[PDB]
Amino acid sequence: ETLGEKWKKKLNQLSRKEFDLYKKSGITEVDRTEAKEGLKRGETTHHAVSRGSAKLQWFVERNMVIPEGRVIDLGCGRGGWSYYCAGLKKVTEVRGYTKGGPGHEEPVPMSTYGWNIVKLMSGKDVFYLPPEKCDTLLCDIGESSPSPTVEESRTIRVLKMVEPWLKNNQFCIKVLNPYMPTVIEHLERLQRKHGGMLVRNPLSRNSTHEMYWISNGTGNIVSSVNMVSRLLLNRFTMTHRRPTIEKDVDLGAGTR
Numbered sequence: 001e002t003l004g005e006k007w008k009k010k011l012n013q014l015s016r017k018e019f020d021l022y023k024k025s026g027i028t029e030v031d032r033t034e035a036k037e038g039l040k041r042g043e044t045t046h047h048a049v050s051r052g053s054a055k056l057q058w059f060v061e062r063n064m065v066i067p068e069g070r071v072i073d074l075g076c077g078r079g080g081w082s083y084y085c086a087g088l089k090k091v092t093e094v095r096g097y098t099k100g101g102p103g104h105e106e107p108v109p110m111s112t113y114g115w116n117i118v119k120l121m122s123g124k125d126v127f128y129l130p131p132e133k134c135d136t137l138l139c140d141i142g143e144s145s146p147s148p149t150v151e152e153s154r155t156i157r158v159l160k161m162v163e164p165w166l167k168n169n170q171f172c173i174k175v176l177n178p179y180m181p182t183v184i185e186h187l188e189r190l191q192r193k194h195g196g197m198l199v200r201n202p203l204s205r206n207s208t209h210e211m212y213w214i215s216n217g218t219g220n221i222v223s224s225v226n227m228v229s230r231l232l233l234n235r236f237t238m239t240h241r242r243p244t245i246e247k248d249v250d251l252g253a254g255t256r
Ligand SMILES: C[S@@+](CC[C@H](N)C(=O)[O-])C[C@H]1O[C@@H](n2cnc3c(N)ncnc32)[C@H](O)[C@@H]1O
Pocket: 049, 050, 051, 052, 053, 074, 075, 076, 077, 078, 079, 080, 081, 082, 097, 098, 099, 100, 103, 104, 105, 124, 125, 126, 127, 140, 141, 142
């Protein structure tokens, strides 16, 4: 049994009260107060539509993924990754796809900088989409489940679906459950072919073991995964550490 499996079993033993105290203990988060208030009023400039804009920004500002040219955003939801990419100097077009409908996020129309080069298409299940040529491939799909075998299936399905979209392009792909041995096998194969590395984002909650496969990096996947399992396991030991608060992103206004 992996350390990740021990983490998941302990997470599943927590009461709701314990879970709620654990999930943000020692993580980093952006202060969404201002954006939430603006979005409730229907403001269409400056605000990021979700926490996702700051989450992808964390990787971009560290050069782990450097969006450029035609960006595909799989599982765009509200559009946080798409609207953030729309303002980046090297980006020329953003196409977001998301399922939408009951139980899923609809794209939120915005007028943040570069909105005119964004097209968000809901009602699209990416598992039935044929691949398109793109210079940057983004994917933020992977629904958590109390069952790690359900998560294992969901993760492998994402890894198999994204591969045909990868053609010597920039990429950033969520890996929901990176600790199951079958997932590690796929990730190692994918890294041998497409390069890159798996990275834990500090803005992720402790309630998910998600890591992101980014194109610009190297390293040992197994070591990085076990480091996260040990980090998350140790976060059950101590009393709640309030999250480290950071400023949210200002996505500005205007066309390009
Ligand atoms: C973690 S959210 C994406 C958040 C987004 N990156 C942002 O910045 O706002 C993952 C999204 O994938 C969508 N999704 C899940 N399964 C999908 C599928 N089969 N096809 C398309 N979208 C899917 C979910 O509805 C959800 O909105």
